[PDB]
Design a binder for these strands. Sequence first.
DNA 1: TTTTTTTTTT
DNA 2: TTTTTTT
Lengths: 219, 218, 220, 220
Amino acid sequence: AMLPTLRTGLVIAAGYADKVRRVLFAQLRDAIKSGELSNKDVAMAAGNLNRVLFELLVNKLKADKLDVVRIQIDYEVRDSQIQFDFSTLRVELWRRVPEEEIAPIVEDFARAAPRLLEEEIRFTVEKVGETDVGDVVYRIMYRGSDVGALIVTPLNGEALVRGAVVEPTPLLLKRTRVQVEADRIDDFVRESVSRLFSEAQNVEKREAVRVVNEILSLV
Amino acid sequence: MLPTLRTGLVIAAGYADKVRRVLFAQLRDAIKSGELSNKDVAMAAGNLNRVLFELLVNKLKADKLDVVRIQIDYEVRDSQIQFDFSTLRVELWRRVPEEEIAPIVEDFARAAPRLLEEEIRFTVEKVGETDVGDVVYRIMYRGSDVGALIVTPLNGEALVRGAVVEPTPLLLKRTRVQVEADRIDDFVRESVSRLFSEAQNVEKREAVRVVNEILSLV
Amino acid sequence: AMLPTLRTGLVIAAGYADKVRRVLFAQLRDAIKSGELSNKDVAMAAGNLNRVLFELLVNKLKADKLDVVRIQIDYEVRDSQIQFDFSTLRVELWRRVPEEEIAPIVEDFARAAPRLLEEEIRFTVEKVGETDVGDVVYRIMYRGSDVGALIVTPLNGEALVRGAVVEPTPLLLKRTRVQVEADRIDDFVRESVSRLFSEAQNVEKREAVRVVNEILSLVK
Amino acid sequence: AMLPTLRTGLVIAAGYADKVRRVLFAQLRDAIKSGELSNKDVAMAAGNLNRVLFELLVNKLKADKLDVVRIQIDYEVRDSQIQFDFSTLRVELWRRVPEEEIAPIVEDFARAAPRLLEEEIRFTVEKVGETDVGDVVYRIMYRGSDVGALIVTPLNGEALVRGAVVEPTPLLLKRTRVQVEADRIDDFVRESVSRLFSEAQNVEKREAVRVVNEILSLVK
DNA sequence: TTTTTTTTTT
DNA sequence: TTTTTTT
């Protein structure tokens, strides 16, 4: 039987304690109201966990209070008692990069940002293969790295284009008809890929990711 | 003053969907009024994400498993969103490898039930007295200041109140004990750890304010 | 033009105050750290607002402490002081439906739910039109209400079928090739739509919603 | 042994499905990475639950998509399989109050708001009892309803006053020394309680609640 | 086309 | 990647 898991999510090390206490109270809200637990039992349980985590985070790992941690642990509630399974204790740590190292870089970049904000991104492609019914699949790239996929369906004298990229920003190229005879497909894609995505939809990452995988799966 | 887009803590791999969701949440009202369209906002979030990609991946060389926090002011004028890049702020936290943390976490996990039963040793030091004659002590944990304690002398009796922030936020309820005023200082040093063994587990901010309340009286 | 906005989002009326406090501190974190404001200034501002909002909810709106509210208001910071624009004040209210009215319905339904959990989602379709290049687009319905869309591309003895529904649960029909002559498409689609979505992907609502439109826009 | 519980929290009825899917995926992430479950297993589980909830919310409870729902249900993972316990299913519903009924009330209130924002919170008190060491405890009331507590410690011609209120906004009265004779305590408190809290700290509700309970526990 | 909405804080 | 987080 699977056990409930106490998860903090991403939190600044200085505030993990109040995060652990509030999450645990939220999960055991029904248990308290049902009468299986008291508010004292839960607060005491969280306090003991926080007591343990303090030694781990501050002493063993030397985490600064401005660092970021993510903590999770399974726990069991049986017969009016809360018990943690410390074999399930998992702790993630992120160490802070000093402002003196980031602020000047961001400030420098901020001056060049309004130019970059309007520029069209410019992509490159490479043919991946063809389907049984004659669709052509391309890999779409940004700066030599793979960032998306594209599929072209030649039809009665014309072609249909669909695709999506994940980086530098999630874009979805909706089903688009272009003036191309099947003879002109491979040439057209290389000439028009950057231009097609200038009118693409700005979507969420997972939406773009799914389409990329859908298109690449057909090969 | 301008509206600010704030992401909060987010894994670098998912900053884009975070920026998009924050911006849409803030500008829902402008859309329904007809001042903006979903296209207008999505293009705005998309263009910002395009900008942040160069900053995070190339300039800051951030791995996608790191944590970032981004904020920037923006203004909406005549059905368009315009960012003020002078207000752009980016925070970065770099990932500590699992091979450096997991074994340390593993060994401690064996020692956790042992430590959990142990009572939390505190030590104290005299700070001063209040206007009405209360005695204030500074509570220390492993030599470091973590809380405060206040004792109100009576006739053959004393009232004790206090709070600690570390290693876990505790609140010492108003407690009356039978002790003569002459031996209070000895009482505090010998019994402070025993007092907090029956203390309340509270939130950090509650403990913090009580500590400052007690220290402010000096 | 636009002013910063303090937004609570959905919150139980009993806890709106701590929400207003936490949001305002989060938004003015920088102002405090810069020295333009003090922690005292922000706490006092949120407290005064919450005092006012209490009067509105309990007296004017007659909100129960177990109801749900959503509050937003614009504010500006002038000379180390926080000043609200109450003309921008917006308050939404949801009144709780008594447990005595909902619990028996949920309890009754909970008994029949796991059997329903297995059943195939019988769908029906309606032809919407043909695309410029000859794809056929159908509207998918569930219990007479439109819930999704489907597009079919005729081939030589074969067809390509794509689609998505939003209700009763978001499903995505991946690109599927089937054995059917073009004269038989309209018959095939209507006969197999429920069967096709029985093996479809469980996706997010927004994914299904977006796909429906991509398909429906091609006719409209 | 207790089971994991899927909790959505407050969500607009139109967006419950994606809420359920994301919460379930967040809880079962580790199970997926370990290989005990696949993304398909979790997606199918959330999809089946949403299919069931659709009938409950839309058909049985007649919930409008602008309403607010809160859904929770226990589930079990046994041998690479997800199982919901529908006996543990709980659904709360809040029905939306129309803007046409709230906006005029908010707008008129918005006109008197900048005036009210300056105003001090008039309070009343009532004697509850005395402590063992002779402190006097009062119940603080706002609109006839109990909202807080206050404790007075008598000195020689002086007193120490401490207290906290929960409504209309969480306020905590720091340790304050005042000039009052012990017989005139009941009288002093009733004249000054509102004035004392005009300089009290704006805090979170839970801070105030605990101080209130601490003061009341001291009463016999 | 959604039709509701996509945060910060916690 | 993804959440809950005062009756």
